[PDB]
Design a protein around this ligand. Structure first.
Ligand code: CLA
Ligand code: CLA
Ligand code: CLA
Ligand code: CLA
Ligand SMILES: C=Cc1c(C)c2cc3nc(c4c5[nH]c(cc6nc(cc1[nH]2)C(C)=C6CC)c(C)c5C(=O)[C@@H]4C(=O)OC)[C@@H](CCC(=O)OC/C=C(\C)CCC[C@H](C)CCC[C@H](C)CCCC(C)C)[C@@H]3C
Ligand SMILES: CC(C)=CCC/C(C)=C/CC/C(C)=C/CC/C(C)=C/CC/C(C)=C/CC/C(C)=C/CC/C(C)=C/CC/C(C)=C/CC/C(C)=C/CC1=CC(=O)C(C)=C(C)C1=O
Ligand SMILES: CCCCCCCCCCCCCCCCCC(=O)OC[C@H](CO[C@@H]1O[C@H](CO)[C@H](O)[C@H](O)[C@H]1O)OC(=O)CCCCCCCCCCCCCCCCC
Ligand SMILES: CCCCCCCCCCCCCCCCCC(=O)OC[C@H](CO[C@@H]1O[C@H](CO)[C@H](O)[C@H](O)[C@H]1O)OC(=O)CCCCCCCCCCCCCCCCC
Ligand SMILES: CC1=C(/C=C/C(C)=C/C=C/C(C)=C/C=C/C=C(C)/C=C/C=C(C)/C=C/C2=C(C)CCCC2(C)C)C(C)(C)CCC1
Ligand SMILES: CC1=C(/C=C/C(C)=C\C=C\C(C)=C\C=C\C=C(C)\C=C\C=C(C)\C=C\C2=C(C)CCCC2(C)C)C(C)(C)CCC1
Ligand SMILES: CC1=C(/C=C/C(C)=C\C=C\C(C)=C\C=C\C=C(C)\C=C\C=C(C)\C=C\C2=C(C)CCCC2(C)C)C(C)(C)CCC1
Ligand SMILES: [Fe+2]
Lengths: 27, 67, 30, 38, 484, 76, 30, 31, 348, 36, 31, 31, 38, 30
């Protein structure tokens, strides 16, 4: 449900996912 | 010496009869200009769409467009 | 893999038959 | 007898003999392929 | 006389043999198409359409067969899983037989055109010398091209007469051949939208018909005639080869990037989907939904389809093979038999670690275990001396859910290392290897081989277009110069 | 035709180039010494090499909002 | 609607037309 | 024997065929 | 033209003013070649003194940071931008030149304008060859440099993830790209690359041997030791003894050239063939299709701990290359590989 | 016209370029990027 | 004058000496 | 590809050598 | 024009170009043998 | 099996080097 938890779940696997490349200007 | 004469050859002879018939003047270079520039801007539109260099209200250029 | 070799050899044989029949040296009659 | 060889000969093989050679090789291959492949 | 690199210039000014050699090239291409798909059907294994699809077997012309609408076969099986009770005349090897009989007809026509070359059609009634009415020939050919494009876009893909096209879901799960309605807006120009293809072909056909009519009407001028070397058929040759490596670059780009007419289900995935975590993101948000509302990660992994996990594998990447890792992907890694589930790694204190995904650029990659915050917690120890990151001293256990292994937690260091190395490549799958003598390395997808071959062909044709441009503009000083 | 021989040996050519070349040299000196290149260019000075927030190399990691992203990751 | 990317596209194309006109003027001004 | 026989068959169908083609073309190009 | 009246128009006036003798030939091809080449060289020379790579690659690549000539480079755009062209007006920069420089968009700008400059230079060769009417074998041989340029600056990044893996405009950056293919691709073991290196060293062979042979089998034409003035621009006789050259090379090498035309055409032939095959090889590399692993040799090395070869030594050195590459060459992967996981030998 | 010799002009240009090259090589032992 | 050779020489003469003076100032830039 | 390499290398040797030999003896037959 | 064809042509290639072609094929086999073998 | 092929094709290569060296086309002075 939460997009921030799946963001931190995809990050240790890879740092090039489209959802990590979109709306990451907050980080 | 003549060639091989055939009915369909006699039928479609006017398709290949005026080998080299041309008109004087420059012809249609203004439409060369406008059509070539239109093809150019069209090809750039599709290039920048496929490059994700242009963003519209209906294009995504991603696999979810299959939905 | 053997069947393709067999079929190739036979189609080559029929090719040689067709070649010998239709593109032979004409008799000279001289 | 001289510096060049006097027995200089030209080898001939016409098109009909070419036909016979090609057919001989291909028919021999067709016949013996089943035994060579075993 | 003419050297070996000029032999075909015996038919530069002979239209009967030009038509004849075009006919026999057409015959050879059609015969190759038929023989190639016969070979592909003979060597195809339809045992598992999901875990061993056609692009995992190196099928090249068969995905193109399945692209336009031919899905069933006379062998009683369809690639989508259904059984072809009445596959009809147009099966895979039925289309092969059609190609073969077309090739035979074209070869006979080629022999006829060679033996009958002195046709008065190639003789103009003005002077009787050899000439071709190039403006009218191009106008006629453009008219036929427009008519065929408009028909293909108005009846074949629209499905009112034809079968439509193969459209799949964004993540390539279901897939189906159906009619597609035209998209007349910017969505029609969306390259991943299949609704633009009928509109594209309809508009292109209408424009081609009008342009061919205008060519049939109006003759060219003297200035372009003496500029573009209009009098030479080699100008047509140079322009046509320019157009075909234009289209070669187009098809190489659209195959490497993916588009509407390039389905993942038929042609394999793209390396950019792996590098963008597309299937992984799909699986993980399919987990976030139905995990955030109860029924936690102990179960519901079986709710994850097995095709999706097969897609989340770097061996499924089209850019993991080599130039000479030759053949089928199954001959590379073995045929997938089942999914063992997503590996969840946990260390001795409780945080959930994750294995780093292998970048496409690497043939080998170290195995590391990273925390949620993005700092490596463990690694496969190369040195194993004065190392304090090894699994043998950190204490990481691996657990699986929803697959052949579900709820099983391994704590043994050797097996957790081996399965971490297996999960380094993505998902975890079991592969049968002794049936095809698998070497071990990864192979390349038909999409990747297609793109490589067409890029090389496009470069060679760019060289050919430069050479033919020189030939066209310099048809007067080949044998020598004017020496004055 | 003036084939590069009389031109360089001509006092008329030399006098009019006794000012322009030193002027261009001085302008090129001042364009870097006054920091105008740093201003209109976006290149970071060694004193403003790093910000206080990040001690490491900058990472854009974006494609569309990269303009305002490099705005907030540059040396202001 | 009209996107900023499309606005920049229109500005770039009219700028290219201006560049073409400037090229023509510079080559005809001997 | 599944592929050594293939190699033997290939050598047998080419080498004398090539030799015959050498002699035939050597005669055909001479009038 | 064509014995018709042909009233002079704007096209005729432009052609007559364009194809004429000047110090620099303008012609029609100068409508593109001059501005595109000028923009490319200006952008590169500006980049090697000004453009910092601290936001594109996180490196130093210009004289403004203190770099020298080799380490200065016009750096590629960030891989997060993918294969975007990075227009200054486009969504990356949106009209702001100052931050368009920090985006690395001038890499794509200079690469594009240099491709158009290559096109314009070939068109200039073709136009000159048309203007004074001899065969365009210079353009035929020039077909290979543009093939190399396309295949390494556009085909490889378009096949890979993005322009970041494309080479950057700069000597040390080209060296980085070269070692990148050494490690990731095993470019030395690539067959098309061996085709190319064989062709290029053979081109060096033919150039050196042709110059030395011509200058060493010269006729007298003398009564003076300076043989350079022995040649006259207007003469229809040979200046070097080709038959003596043929005898010398037949007795030294075993074979010799019997034709100046075929000699010069093969001298043309060797580097164009080499560069075209190298272009095909890097095109094959563009889609991760390499001559990396010999399957049988790696198998016997796997089941034989004593079977050491130079090929296996190269393979192991290449994964060592890549293991050291990843962390400091791929910031967007942020691969925080620890010291222990790095493969290394005893001592050192 | 020929009042200043061409060899003199070339000598001045060459000494300017050589001294500038010496300055640039001096700029590798001081200033930015000089390991100090 | 303003000939084609004039423009061709100046477009490669003015900016190269501009950046040349830039590098000359840039060598003496301290830390 | 242990003996697939054999058959591929064999045909890659055979087809151009037979082709070149045929056209060469065509050349050499006519003096 | 007539029943026989005016483009009746003889193709030629000297032994020097034979040497070029055969050495080209032989060294191509040398280069690609270890790759097709793998 | 591969060693035989390597040796045979390499000795054929050096043999045809020998053939091109000694049994070449003799050039004419005319
Ligand atoms: C459909 C495109 C096309 C067509 C119709 C032609 C037609 C022609 N070309 Mg040409 N060419 C092309 C593309 C094309 N070319 C391309 C892409 C290149 C770049 C490589 C060239 C480079 C080229 C050169 C350098 C020359 C020609 C020449 C010629 C003329 C004589 C050809 C000849 O007899 O050589 C004979 C060819 C052979 C005997 C065998 C060639 C086959 C090679 C060895 C590879 C084998 C391929 C395989 C069997 C099939 C693969 C095909 C498939 C992958 C596409 C002829 C009119 C010649 C010319 O202009 O006359 C002065 C000339 O010298 N071409
Ligand atoms: C558009 C062209 C094209 C493309 C993209 C493909 C692609 C593919 N083919 Mg295919 N094929 C083609 C044309 C093509 N083919 C043609 C024209 C034929 C008829 C001869 C075949 C016959 C064929 C068969 C019989 C088979 C395939 C197979 C395959 C798949 C396995 C990968 C592979 O090819 O190995 C690797 C690709 C390469 C190594 C490319 C080689 C690069 C160049 C050409 C190197 C050679 C140059 C050098 C001078 C040769 C000297 C070597 C010599 C010493 C022996 C793959 C997806 C296999 C398959 O999966 O079944 C369907 C299979 O068994 N193909
Ligand atoms: C009766 C006509 C006909 C029909 C119905 C088919 C049907 C089919 N063919 Mg086929 N073919 C034909 C004729 C035909 N062919 C002929 C005459 C040849 C010899 C040249 C071939 C050679 C051939 C081969 C080699 C192959 C097929 C294949 C196929 C199958 C898949 C098609 C595909 O994916 O390729 C894609 C087709 C296209 C992408 C068509 C694109 C047309 C180009 C891009 C036009 C663009 C240029 C044009 C001038 C632009 C006009 C300008 C405009 C403004 C007007 C399919 C069932 C494939 C197969 O699986 O084998 C069975 C395959 O390998 N065919
Ligand atoms: C030889 C002339 C020439 C050519 C061929 C090009 C070509 C190109 N330039 Mg370039 N440029 C030039 C001169 C030229 N330039 C000059 C002199 C300058 C200095 C001002 C620039 C500065 C420049 C920059 C800063 C950039 C480019 C870029 C580009 C590329 C893409 C341009 C684009 O996005 O839209 C294409 C433009 C055209 C196709 C122009 C044609 C105009 C059409 C045919 C007419 C339509 C306009 C019409 C009036 C519409 C209004 C109708 C209305 C009244 C209703 C492209 C290949 C971009 C790039 O390199 O990408 C990285 C980029 O950012 N150029
Ligand atoms: C790195 C090696 C190398 C360089 C630098 C080079 C340079 C050159 N070759 C030319 C020609 C040729 N090259 C040829 C064959 C070859 N050339 C080769 C190797 C080279 N050739 C090889 C190996 C071959 C064998 C096939 C031929 C056949 C020709 C010609 O016809 C021509 C000539 O007459 O030779 C004297 C000249 C015309 C270029 C020009 O004005 O384009 C105009 C376009 C320009 C200037 C724009 C280019 C801008 C580039 C693409 C982007 C920016 C790059 C920066 C400026 C520099 C970046 C450098 C870093 C990457 C390190 C130029 C001096
Ligand atoms: C057991 C065994 C045998 C051990 C050894 C095994 C071993 C390790 C084998 C590997 C070797 C091997 C072949 C591997 C290499 C594989 C590979 C790279 C293949 C090469 C592929 C190839 C075809 C490249 C094509 C690219 C290209 C066209 C280059 C060709 C280069 C070429 C031939 C150039 C000529 C070179 C050269 C020697 C020039 C001599 C020319 C010459 C005689 C000029 C002299 C001369 C000058 C004048 O001025 C005049 C006037 C006259 C008159 C005159 O004459
Ligand atoms: C030879 C003769 C011509 C000589 C010189 C001509 C010079 C041309 C200079 C411009 C070249 C084109 C540059 C832009 C192309 C581009 O951005 O492509 C990249 C973009 C796609 O962009 C990519 O899309 C992917 C989709 O999964 C991913 O999302 C990537 O992240 C995204 O960057 O495609 C295009 O817009 C044009 C593609 C068609 C052009 C094909 C050229 C060869 C392509 C090869 C692809 C790999 C194989
Ligand atoms: C000599 C000419 C052929 C050389 C290649 C021989 C490959 C050996 C082989 O195994 O083949 C045989 C291979 C099959 O190979 C076998 O396949 C089996 C399943 O089919 C298994 O997977 C086996 O593991 C595998 O070895 O198939 C082929 O025919 C190779 C296709 C060749 C064409 C590929 C595309 C090339 C496209 C463009 C390249 C040219 C570009 C321009 C020029 C440069
Ligand atoms: C006569 C007749 C017939 C029959 C027909 C047939 C049977 C056909 C066929 C055919 C076929 C069965 C074909 C196939 C084929 C193949 C091909 C045509 C191919 C090819 C080639 C190529 C092109 C290649 C190239 C290459 C190589 C060599 C390798 C790899 C790489 C490359 C690519 C380079 C009929 C009954 C109908 C009718 C009547 C009579
Ligand atoms: C960027 C850009 C642009 C463009 C520009 C241009 C087009 C121009 C230019 C420019 C240039 C062009 C510059 C330059 C530089 C240069 C230099 C820097 C140089 C050098 C050289 C040297 C340093 C050397 C010396 C020497 C010596 C000392 C020794 C001996 C002799 C010699 C000579 C070698 C613009 C703005 C539009 C915008 C976009 C981007
Ligand atoms: C290569 C070249 C050139 C040249 C340049 C230059 C830059 C030159 C110079 C130079 C110089 C500018 C020189 C000077 C000098 C002087 C000297 C070399 C001297 C001496 C001697 C001695 C022995 C010493 C002594 C002493 C002592 C012991 C210590 C102190 C005192 C005294 C000094 C007395 C030219 C352009 C023409 C042409 C082209 C290239
Ligand atoms: Fe010479």
């Amino acid at each position: 449900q939460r997009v921030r938890t799946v963001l931190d779940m995809d990050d240790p696997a890879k740092e090039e996912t489209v959802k990590e490349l979109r709306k990451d200007i907050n980080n | 010496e003549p060639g091989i004469v055939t009915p369909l050859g006699t039928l479609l002879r006017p398709l290949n009869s005026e080998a080299g018939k041309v008109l004087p003047g420059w012809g249609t270079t203004v439409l060369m200009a406008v059509a070539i520039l239109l093809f150019a801007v069209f090809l750039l539109i599709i290039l920048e769409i496929y490059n994700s260099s242009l963003i519209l209200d209906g294009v995504t250029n991603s696999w979810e467009s299959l939905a | 893999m053997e069947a393709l070799v067999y079929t190739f050899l036979l189609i080559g044989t029929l090719g040689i038959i067709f070649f010998s029949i239709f593109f032979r040296e004409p008799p000279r009659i001289a | 007898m001289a510096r060049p060889n006097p027995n200089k000969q030209v080898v001939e093989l016409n098109r009909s003999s070419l036909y016979w050679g090609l057919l001989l090789i291909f028919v021999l291959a067709v016949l013996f392929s089943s035994y060579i492949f075993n | 006389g003419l050297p070996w690199y000029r032999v075909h210039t015996v038919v530069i000014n002979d239209p009967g043999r030009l038509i004849s050699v075009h006919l026999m090239h057409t015959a050879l291409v059609a015969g190759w198409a038929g023989a190639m798909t016969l070979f592909e059907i003979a060597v195809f294994d339809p045992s598992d359409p999901v875990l061993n699809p056609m692009w995992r077997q190196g099928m090249f012309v068969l995905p193109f067969l399945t692209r336009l609408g031919v899905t069933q076969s006379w062998g009683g099986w369809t690639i989508s899983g259904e059984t072809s009770s009445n596959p009809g005349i147009w099966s895979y090897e039925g289309a092969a037989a059609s190609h073969i009989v077309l090739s035979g007809l074209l070869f006979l026509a080629s022999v006829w055109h060679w033996v009958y070359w002195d046709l008065e059609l190639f003789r103009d009634p003005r002077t009787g010398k050899t000439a071709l009415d190039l403006p009218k020939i191009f106008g006629i050919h453009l008219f036929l091209a427009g008519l065929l494009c408009f028909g293909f876009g108005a009846f074949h893909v629209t499905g009112v007469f034809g079968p439509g096209i193969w459209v799949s879901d964004p993540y390539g799960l279901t897939g189906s051949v159906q009619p597609v309605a035209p998209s007349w807006g910017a969505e029609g120009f969306d390259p991943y939208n299949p609704g633009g293809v009928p509109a594209h072909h309809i508009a292109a056909g209408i424009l081609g018909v009008l342009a061919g009519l205008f060519h049939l009407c109006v003759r060219p001028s003297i200035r372009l005639y003496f500029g573009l070397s209009m009098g030479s058929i080699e100008s047509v040759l140079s322009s046509s080869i320019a157009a075909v490596f234009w289209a070669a670059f187009v098809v190489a780009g659209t195959m490497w990037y993916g588009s509407a007419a390039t389905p993942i289900e038929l042609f394999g995935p793209t390396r950019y989907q792996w590098d963008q975590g597309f299937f992984q993101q799909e699986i993980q948000k399919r987990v976030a939904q139905s995990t955030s509302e109860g029924l936690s990660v102990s179960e519901a992994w079986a709710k994850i389809p097995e095709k999706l996990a097969f897609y989340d594998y770097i061996g499924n990447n089209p850019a993991k093979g080599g130039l000479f890792r030759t053949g089928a992907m199954n001959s590379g890694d073995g045929i997938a038999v089942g999914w063992l589930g997503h590996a969840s790694f946990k260390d001795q204190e409780g945080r959930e670690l994750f294995v780093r995904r292998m970048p496409t650029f690497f043939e080998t990659f170290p195995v590391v275990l990273i925390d949620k915050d993005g700092v490596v917690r463990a690694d496969v120890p190369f040195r194993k001396a004065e190392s304090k990151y090894s699994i043998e001293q950190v204490g990481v256990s691996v657990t699986f859910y929803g697959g052949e292994l579900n709820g099983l937690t391994f704590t043994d260091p050797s097996t957790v290392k081996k399965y971490a190395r297996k999960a380094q490549l993505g998902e975890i799958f079991e592969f049968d290897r002794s049936t095809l003598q698998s070497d071990g390395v990864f192979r390349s997808s038909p999409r990747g081989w297609f793109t490589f071959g067409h890029l090389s062909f496009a470069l060679l044709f760019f060289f050919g277009h430069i050479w033919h441009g020189s030939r066209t503009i310099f048809r007067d000083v080949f044998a020598g110069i004017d020496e004055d | 035709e003036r084939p590069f021989s009389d031109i360089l040996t001509s006092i008329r050519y030399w006098v009019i180039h006794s000012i322009t070349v030193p002027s261009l040299f001085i302008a090129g000196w001042l364009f870097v010494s006054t920091g105008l290149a740093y201003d209109v260019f976006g290149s970071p000075r060694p004193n403003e090499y790093f910000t206080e927030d990040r001690q490491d190399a900058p990472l854009i990691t974006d494609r569309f909002n990269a303009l305002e992203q490099v705005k907030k990751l540059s040396a202001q | 609607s009209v996107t900023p990317s499309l606005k920049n596209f229109l500005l770039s194309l009219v700028a290219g037309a201006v560049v073409l006109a400037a090229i023509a003027g510079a080559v005809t001004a001997v | 024997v599944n592929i050594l026989g293939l190699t033997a068959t290939a050598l047998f169908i080419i080498i004398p065929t090539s030799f015959l083609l050498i002699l035939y073309v050597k005669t055909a190009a001479s009038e | 033209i064509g014995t018709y009246q042909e009233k002079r128009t704007w096209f005729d006036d432009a052609d007559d003013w364009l194809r004429q003798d000047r110090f620099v030939f303008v012609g029609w091809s100068g409508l593109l070649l001059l501005p595109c080449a000028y923009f490319a060289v200006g952008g590169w020379l500006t980049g090697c003194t000004f453009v910092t790579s601290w936001y594109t690659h996180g490196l130093a690549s210009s004289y403004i940071e203190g770099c020298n000539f080799l380490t200065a480079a016009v750096s590629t755009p960030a891989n997060s931008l993918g294969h975007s062209l990075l227009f200054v007006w486009g969504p990356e920069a949106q009209g702001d030149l100052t931050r368009w420089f920090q985006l690395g968009g001038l890499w794509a700008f200079v690469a594009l304008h240099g491709a158009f400059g290559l096109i314009g230079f070939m068109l200039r060769q073709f136009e000159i060859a048309r203007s004074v009417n001899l065969r365009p074998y210079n353009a035929i041989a020039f077909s290979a440099p543009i093939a190399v340029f396309v295949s390494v600056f556009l085909i490889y990044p378009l096949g890979q993830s993005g322009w970041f893996f494309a080479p950057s405009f700069g000597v040390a950056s080209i060296f980085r790209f070269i070692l990148f293919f050494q490690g990731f691709h095993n470019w030395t073991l690539n067959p098309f690359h061996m085709m190319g290196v064989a062709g290029v060293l053979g081109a060096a062979l033919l150039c050196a041997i042709h110059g030395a042979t011509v200058e060493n089998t010269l006729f007298e034409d003398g009564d003076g030791a300076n043989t350079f003035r022995a040649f006259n621009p207007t003469q229809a006789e040979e200046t070097y003894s080709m038959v003596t050259a043929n005898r010398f090379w037949s007795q030294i090498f075993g074979v010799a050239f019997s034709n100046k035309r075929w000699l010069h055409f093969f001298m043309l032939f060797v580097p164009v063939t080499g560069l075209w095959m190298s272009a095909l090889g890097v095109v094959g590399l563009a889609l991760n299709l390499r001559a990396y692993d010999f399957v049988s040799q790696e198998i016997r090395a796997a089941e034989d701990p004593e079977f050491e070869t130079f090929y296996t030594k190269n393979i192991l050195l290449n994964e060592g290359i890549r293991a050291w590459m990843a962390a400091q060459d791929q910031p967007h992967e942020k691969l925080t590989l620890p010291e222990e996981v790095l493969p290394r030998g005893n001592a050192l | 016209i020929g009042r200043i010799p061409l060899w003199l002009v070339g000598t001045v240009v060459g000494l300017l370029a050589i001294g500038l090259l010496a300055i640039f090589f001096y700029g590798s032992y001081v200033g930015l990027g000089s390991s100090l | 004058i303003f000939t084609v050779r004039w423009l061709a020489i100046h477009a490669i003469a003015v900016p190269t000496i501009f950046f040349l003076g830039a590098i000359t100032a840039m060598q003496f830039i301290q830390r």
